[PDB]
RNA sequence: GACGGGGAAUCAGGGUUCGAUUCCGGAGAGGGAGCCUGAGAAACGGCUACCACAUCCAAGGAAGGCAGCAGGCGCGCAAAUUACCCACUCCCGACCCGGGGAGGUAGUGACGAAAAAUAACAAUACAGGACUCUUUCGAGGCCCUGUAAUUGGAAUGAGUCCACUUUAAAUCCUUUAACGAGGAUCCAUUGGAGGGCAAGUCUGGUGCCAGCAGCCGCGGUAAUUCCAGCUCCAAUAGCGUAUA
C-alpha cells in the first residue's frame, strides 16, 4: 500500500510520541484544585545581610 | 570457583593458501553439487576426515597382535560401517586411506532426502528440511547436517503435522480459503 | 654441531645461549632499553593531545606534502609525530584535542616515503576517523 | 588552484554522482548456487584464452 | 528506580539510568558531609539527589524528561535538543587558555565569567579534584606561549602526587578556598610575570 | 486423547512414597497442565488426588513427548512431613512470610547495635 | 615486565613461547614490629604502638583500614548489576527447623566456541547442449539446463500476542491457540580489483597538487593503483587495522 512513509524507524517513534503527548495531555485534564504541592521560597539579598 | 565446563574445540581449519584457483574451483564444485552453504562446512568435513585419517595412520604404524591397535581399529571400522561410508567387504584398517570427501557428503541428510525420491532438487530438500517436515523414526529433524546411519535409512518420511505427509493445511492455504469464502459468501 | 660427544651437553647449551644472545630480533625483546626507549611502552595503542599540525615532505623519487601532527603522549610525556591517514581529515583535528594513536604496522619503523614517522592517528576526540570520513558521525561541540 | 597546501581538494571539487536503484542481490546459499551455475554449468568450449568475469572489451 | 532519564549535557543530550535517590534528613541542608538516606519512590515538591554511572558533562537549569517507553533509537530527545539549540546563555568557547577547575558547576561558571571579564582564555572545564591528567594538560600548554600554563583550583583539594609531578616541570596551582583571595593571587601573578 | 505411561517405578517403605518417571504422550495438543497428570494418576492408582506430587515436566523436541517425575504418597500428613516447602506452596498448602533479605539483614544489624530488652523494640 | 606445578597455543620428526586466572601448595591483608584467647593464629570483617594518608569534634577527646560482594575515584589501549534466593552442591552451630554476596539464578556481554534464515517450485517469453537423417536451413525439444521487475498458487521462520511448561517466584528453551511476506522495503556488511594474491587496459574530475601504497612502486593536463558511478572478486553474521 501507499499510505505511510518508506522506512519503519522514522514512523515507529511517531506512535510513541503521540502516546507521550496524549498521556501528558490527559495528565493536564484530570487535576485537583485543592491539596496542592509545596511552593519554593527563594531567598535573595546582598553581602552580609 | 564456579560450576561451568569451559570445554570447546574448533571444528574446521583455514587453508594455508588463501587464493588458489584449483582449490576454489573444487570447493565451489562440491558446494554446488552437494547443496552446501559456505566453505566452513566443507572445511569441517575435511577436518573430521583428516582426524580419521591421522588416527588410522597412527594405528597402522604399530605392529599386529597388539590389543590396543586391534581394539581401536575394530571400534573405528565398526563405527564407519555403522555410519554408512564403508561396507562389510572392505573391512580392513588399511582401506581407510582410500576414502574421499564425497563419501562423507553422500551420507548427509540433505542429499539423502533429495535422492530418496521425495524432493525435487537438493536446495528444495534443504528448504523442506529446515521448515520442520522430514522426520526420522518419529522425531522431527529440522537441520540438514544430520549424518544418517544404515539402520535408520528406511525411516525417512514427512512428519505427521506436515501437509505433505497428511496433516493440517498451512498458513497460505487457509488464508486463501478464507479469502475465497469471504468473497463467495 | 662441532662438539659431538656423549656427555657434552652443558657446552652445547652454553654455546647456543651465547649465540642466541648474539642476535638482533631476540636481543631487542630481551633488553629493557628497547622497551624504555619505545614511546608506547610495549602497548599497542596510545592516547595523546594535539599540539600543532605540521607538514613533512616525501623522499627523492616521489614528491608530495604528507601532512602529519605533533602529539605529546599522556602516560609519559614523550613528543612524537603522527600521520593523519586518509584524505582531507586534517579539518577534523584541531589543536589541544585528544587523539588515539596507533602504529603503522612495521614494528616501530618508518613506512613508505615519509621520514621519521612511526605512528598514525586512528581516532580523534573519542570518535573514529572512518565514521567522520564516511559521514556517519559528527564532531560534538 | 588556490594553494599547494589545500587539504582535501580533490574530494571537495569532484562531481557528485548519485547512487542507482538496483535489485536486491540474494545473499547466503542461493548466491553460491548462482556462482556454481554461472561457472560450471553455462561454460562453452572456447579456444585460445578465456576472458575474465569482468572482461569489458 | 527502574526507568531511564534524559539529562542535557555539553556534547548534546545524554541518556542514563537512575541508580538511587539520596534524600537528606529534613533538619539539614543538601551541603552535608554524607548524611543521606535511600528511597525507592519520592513524593512531589522535594529536593532529591539523582546519582548515575556516566554523566560527567551536564548543564544545570535545564529540564529532564523521564522516558517510560524504550529509547530504542535517539529520536525522543529531538524536542530537548530543540530546547537547547535556543537560549544558550553560557556559551562555552573552547579556546586555548587557562585550565580552570572547581568543585561545583556554579563556581566553575563564575570563574569562567571572571576570566571573560578579565580577557583571559580558557581551555579545560573539568569539575572535581585535581589529578595528574590536568597537570599533564597544563604541561601540554607549557609549550607554545607558556603564559597560560597554570591550574586554577578553587575550594577543592589537590592530590599529593599531582603536586609532586607539578613542581617537577613547573605547573603552578592557585589552590585557594577563598574566591577573592584566588582573584588577587592570580592578578599578582599576572603582574609579576 | 492424552495417555501417560510409568517408567522406573519403585516403592520406598522408609520414606513412605513411591518414585516414578512419567512419559506424557500428547500428539497434536500442547503440554497438558499438572492437574491433568495429578487426576490421571489419581484414577490410575485409585487414590485421592491430594497426595499426587508431580514436577519437572520438559517437552521434548518434536511436539508430543513430555518427561516428568511423580511422587505418590500414602498419607497427607506423611506427605506434609517429608516434602520441600515450595511444592506445598504450589499446591496451596503452605504459605511463606513475605520479607526480603535486605530488610532482615538490616534488622539483624540494628538489633546487633543495641543490647538488652531494647532489641525487641528496635526492630518493630 | 619471576608465585611453583597439573596445563595452553603453534606443531611431520626435534623444538619455541606462555601459565595472574576456577584444582594442589606457598604468601599477604598499607608496610614493618609485638601479643591475648584457643587444640589449631604472630589472625587483621581480633588487639597494642610507628610512619604515610585520613573521618567527627561543644577542640577536652573518639572511631578506622573492600588485594570479600555490589559501587566510586585515579591509572589507562584495557575489563559488567550500589539486583533475587538459600530451592539445588556443601559448610558452621546446643541442633530434622536457624544462617551463608560460599554458591545458585537473572542483567550487561561480537574474549571465544557449536548449530543455523536472508528461498524453492510450475507455464510462456530467449540462449545453449546431447539422437539415425535433413553436410549448412528449421521442425521433432516427448528427456533438459540456464536467467528475465512476466504471471500464479502452495510452505514456514524472525516479531507482536493467549495458554502450557521451567523455576524459590519469574525470565530463557520446547509445545501450542489467533494474527504474521512478492520488488517476500521482513532491503548483509567488511576489504579489494598492476604483481605478490582471487578480480575491468570501463566511464567522468584533479594534474608529482590532493592522495594511494605492509614491499616493488602509482600521480608530470589520455592514471588498468588517486577521488566518484556501474560491473566483478574473497570470506560471510562476519570482516579490516595496531601490538606480544
Short mmCIF file of C-alpha atoms (C1' of nucleotides) in Angstrom, two decimals, chain G residues 7-222:
data_model
loop_
_atom_site.label_atom_id
_atom_site.label_comp_id
_atom_site.label_asym_id
_atom_site.label_seq_id
_atom_site.Cartn_x
_atom_site.Cartn_y
_atom_site.Cartn_z
"C1'" G G 7 48.34 -27.35 31.96
"C1'" A G 8 47.68 -23.79 26.95
"C1'" A G 9 48.93 -22.15 21.65
"C1'" U G 10 51.83 -23.46 17.45
"C1'" C G 11 53.24 -28.24 15.98
"C1'" A G 12 55.92 -34.12 10.24
"C1'" G G 13 60.10 -35.53 13.23
"C1'" G G 14 63.03 -32.50 17.17
"C1'" G G 15 61.64 -27.73 19.37
"C1'" U G 16 59.71 -22.30 20.71
"C1'" U G 17 56.60 -19.13 23.76
"C1'" C G 18 53.06 -18.54 27.76
"C1'" G G 19 50.85 -20.25 32.66
"C1'" A G 20 47.85 -13.55 37.44
"C1'" U G 21 43.44 -16.89 36.08
"C1'" U G 22 38.11 -21.65 38.79
"C1'" C G 23 42.37 -27.88 41.00
"C1'" C G 24 47.00 -28.58 44.66
"C1'" G G 25 50.72 -25.99 47.59
"C1'" G G 26 53.01 -21.39 49.28
"C1'" A G 27 52.49 -15.66 50.79
"C1'" G G 28 49.84 -11.13 52.37
"C1'" A G 29 45.64 -8.12 54.13
"C1'" G G 30 49.20 -0.08 53.58
"C1'" G G 31 54.30 -1.85 55.29
"C1'" G G 32 57.37 -3.28 59.23
"C1'" A G 33 57.12 -4.96 64.97
"C1'" G G 34 54.66 -7.27 69.33
"C1'" C G 35 50.71 -10.18 71.62
"C1'" C G 36 45.67 -12.15 74.32
"C1'" U G 37 42.28 -16.27 73.76
"C1'" G G 38 42.10 -21.10 71.75
"C1'" A G 39 43.80 -27.91 70.19
"C1'" G G 40 44.52 -25.04 65.91
"C1'" A G 41 46.68 -17.50 64.61
"C1'" A G 42 52.26 -13.99 65.12
"C1'" A G 43 44.83 -13.91 62.89
"C1'" C G 44 43.88 -8.43 60.83
"C1'" G G 45 35.22 -8.40 58.85
"C1'" G G 46 40.99 -9.73 66.95
"C1'" C G 47 44.05 -6.30 69.99
"C1'" U G 48 48.64 -2.85 71.08
"C1'" A G 49 52.35 1.21 69.40
"C1'" C G 50 55.35 3.77 64.39
"C1'" C G 51 55.29 6.23 59.80
"C1'" A G 52 52.15 7.94 55.22
"C1'" C G 53 47.11 9.18 54.17
"C1'" A G 54 42.54 10.24 56.52
"C1'" U G 55 36.67 10.88 59.41
"C1'" C G 56 33.51 13.57 63.56
"C1'" C G 57 34.57 17.25 67.11
"C1'" A G 58 30.87 21.93 72.07
"C1'" A G 59 38.54 21.18 70.32
"C1'" G G 60 38.68 18.26 76.00
"C1'" G G 61 38.56 13.70 73.03
"C1'" A G 62 36.67 9.44 69.86
"C1'" A G 63 36.43 5.88 65.80
"C1'" G G 64 39.42 3.19 61.17
"C1'" G G 65 41.94 0.02 57.08
"C1'" C G 66 36.95 -3.52 50.43
"C1'" A G 67 44.34 -7.34 47.20
"C1'" G G 68 35.40 -10.11 50.18
"C1'" C G 69 30.22 -8.96 47.29
"C1'" A G 70 27.98 -4.62 44.50
"C1'" G G 71 29.73 0.50 43.75
"C1'" G G 72 33.22 5.32 43.10
"C1'" C G 73 37.81 7.92 42.04
"C1'" G G 74 42.52 7.65 39.59
"C1'" C G 75 45.53 4.75 36.33
"C1'" G G 76 44.95 3.63 31.44
"C1'" C G 77 44.55 0.77 24.69
"C1'" A G 78 42.25 -2.49 28.65
"C1'" A G 79 37.60 -5.05 31.87
"C1'" A G 80 29.79 -5.84 33.85
"C1'" U G 81 24.23 -5.05 38.27
"C1'" U G 82 25.43 0.34 44.70
"C1'" A G 83 19.80 -6.98 41.55
"C1'" C G 84 16.73 -12.15 43.52
"C1'" C G 85 17.14 -16.67 46.69
"C1'" C G 86 19.29 -20.23 50.42
"C1'" A G 87 15.32 -24.31 46.24
"C1'" C G 88 19.63 -27.29 44.25
"C1'" U G 89 26.01 -28.50 45.89
"C1'" C G 90 28.05 -28.17 50.54
"C1'" C G 91 29.65 -25.74 55.23
"C1'" C G 92 29.15 -23.91 60.95
"C1'" G G 93 26.23 -24.38 65.42
"C1'" A G 94 23.23 -26.62 71.50
"C1'" C G 95 20.59 -28.78 66.54
"C1'" C G 96 15.12 -32.55 61.20
"C1'" C G 97 13.52 -26.49 61.88
"C1'" G G 98 18.32 -21.04 62.02
"C1'" G G 99 22.43 -18.69 58.91
"C1'" G G 100 25.72 -18.47 54.48
"C1'" G G 101 27.43 -11.73 48.44
"C1'" A G 102 30.47 -19.99 49.86
"C1'" G G 103 27.10 -20.85 45.99
"C1'" G G 104 22.92 -20.87 42.54
"C1'" U G 105 19.57 -17.52 39.40
"C1'" A G 106 18.87 -13.38 36.18
"C1'" G G 107 21.01 -8.36 33.77
"C1'" U G 108 25.32 -6.25 30.87
"C1'" G G 109 28.42 -9.25 27.14
"C1'" A G 110 30.60 -9.75 18.91
"C1'" C G 111 37.03 -12.79 24.69
"C1'" G G 112 35.91 -17.15 22.27
"C1'" A G 113 33.25 -21.92 20.57
"C1'" A G 114 28.75 -25.11 18.26
"C1'" A G 115 24.21 -25.34 15.21
"C1'" A G 116 21.84 -22.21 11.67
"C1'" A G 117 17.35 -17.73 7.99
"C1'" U G 118 18.06 -13.74 4.04
"C1'" A G 119 14.30 -19.21 -0.75
"C1'" A G 120 12.28 -23.24 -3.79
"C1'" C G 121 8.78 -24.90 -7.36
"C1'" A G 122 5.24 -24.59 -12.46
"C1'" A G 123 4.00 -22.31 -17.87
"C1'" U G 124 5.50 -18.82 -21.52
"C1'" A G 125 8.93 -15.42 -23.04
"C1'" C G 126 15.18 -16.28 -25.45
"C1'" A G 127 20.40 -18.99 -25.13
"C1'" G G 128 22.78 -23.47 -25.34
"C1'" G G 129 23.76 -28.82 -25.13
"C1'" A G 130 23.38 -34.04 -26.28
"C1'" C G 131 19.74 -38.60 -31.40
"C1'" U G 132 19.57 -42.50 -37.31
"C1'" C G 133 18.94 -38.21 -41.34
"C1'" U G 134 17.82 -33.24 -43.23
"C1'" U G 135 26.63 -31.52 -44.90
"C1'" U G 136 24.90 -25.68 -43.98
"C1'" C G 137 18.17 -24.02 -43.34
"C1'" G G 138 14.11 -25.31 -39.47
"C1'" A G 139 10.96 -28.88 -37.16
"C1'" G G 140 10.85 -33.06 -33.73
"C1'" G G 141 12.86 -30.37 -27.86
"C1'" C G 142 8.27 -36.43 -25.74
"C1'" C G 143 14.28 -36.00 -21.68
"C1'" C G 144 16.54 -30.89 -20.32
"C1'" U G 145 19.64 -26.77 -18.32
"C1'" G G 146 20.34 -21.55 -17.77
"C1'" U G 147 18.17 -16.44 -16.48
"C1'" A G 148 14.05 -12.40 -17.41
"C1'" A G 149 10.71 -6.14 -12.35
"C1'" U G 150 6.00 -11.79 -16.78
"C1'" U G 151 2.28 -14.48 -14.07
"C1'" G G 152 0.48 -17.92 -10.36
"C1'" G G 153 -0.93 -20.56 -6.27
"C1'" A G 154 1.39 -23.65 -2.41
"C1'" A G 155 5.38 -23.78 2.56
"C1'" U G 156 7.31 -21.95 7.21
"C1'" G G 157 10.51 -18.67 10.12
"C1'" A G 158 12.14 -13.62 12.78
"C1'" G G 159 8.34 -10.09 15.60
"C1'" U G 160 3.61 -8.97 18.11
"C1'" C G 161 0.49 -11.78 21.42
"C1'" C G 162 -3.26 -16.17 24.90
"C1'" A G 163 -2.23 -20.64 27.26
"C1'" C G 164 1.05 -24.56 28.84
"C1'" U G 165 5.97 -25.77 30.63
"C1'" U G 166 10.58 -24.20 33.59
"C1'" U G 167 11.88 -22.03 38.37
"C1'" A G 168 12.08 -20.41 45.48
"C1'" A G 169 8.81 -16.74 42.09
"C1'" A G 170 9.97 -15.49 37.25
"C1'" U G 171 12.70 -14.79 32.77
"C1'" C G 172 15.32 -18.44 28.61
"C1'" C G 173 14.32 -23.05 25.60
"C1'" U G 174 10.44 -26.71 23.97
"C1'" U G 175 4.92 -27.31 22.95
"C1'" U G 176 0.70 -24.63 21.34
"C1'" A G 177 -4.02 -21.09 20.16
"C1'" A G 178 -5.10 -16.15 16.92
"C1'" C G 179 -2.69 -12.73 13.59
"C1'" G G 180 2.24 -12.68 10.95
"C1'" A G 181 5.75 -11.78 3.02
"C1'" G G 182 6.47 -10.94 -3.90
"C1'" G G 183 10.19 -5.54 -5.81
"C1'" A G 184 8.66 -11.53 0.22
"C1'" U G 185 11.37 -2.40 1.69
"C1'" C G 186 10.97 -8.53 6.91
"C1'" C G 187 16.47 -4.35 1.90
"C1'" A G 188 24.25 -8.33 4.53
"C1'" U G 189 28.13 -5.94 5.76
"C1'" U G 190 33.95 -5.68 5.70
"C1'" G G 191 38.03 -5.30 2.46
"C1'" G G 192 39.99 -5.31 -2.63
"C1'" A G 193 40.49 -5.28 -8.23
"C1'" G G 194 49.26 -3.65 -11.57
"C1'" G G 195 52.41 -8.03 -9.37
"C1'" G G 196 52.95 -10.93 -4.90
"C1'" C G 197 47.27 -12.61 -4.45
"C1'" A G 198 41.40 -14.29 -6.32
"C1'" A G 199 39.07 -9.99 -9.54
"C1'" G G 200 37.60 -4.06 -15.69
"C1'" U G 201 43.58 -1.80 -20.03
"C1'" C G 202 35.05 0.66 -18.23
"C1'" U G 203 33.21 5.92 -17.85
"C1'" G G 204 33.82 11.25 -15.63
"C1'" G G 205 37.19 15.03 -12.12
"C1'" U G 206 42.49 16.68 -10.26
"C1'" G G 207 47.24 17.02 -12.84
"C1'" C G 208 54.35 14.78 -8.92
"C1'" C G 209 48.83 19.05 -6.02
"C1'" A G 210 45.32 16.14 -3.44
"C1'" G G 211 46.34 11.47 -2.27
"C1'" C G 212 47.28 5.61 -2.80
"C1'" A G 213 50.87 2.23 -1.32
"C1'" G G 214 52.77 -3.88 4.55
"C1'" C G 215 57.05 -4.45 -0.31
"C1'" C G 216 58.07 -3.19 -5.55
"C1'" G G 217 56.12 1.25 -6.86
"C1'" C G 218 51.37 4.73 -8.86
"C1'" G G 219 50.30 10.53 -9.66
"C1'" G G 220 54.30 15.49 -14.96
"C1'" U G 221 46.56 18.16 -18.13
"C1'" A G 222 44.76 10.33 -22.42
#
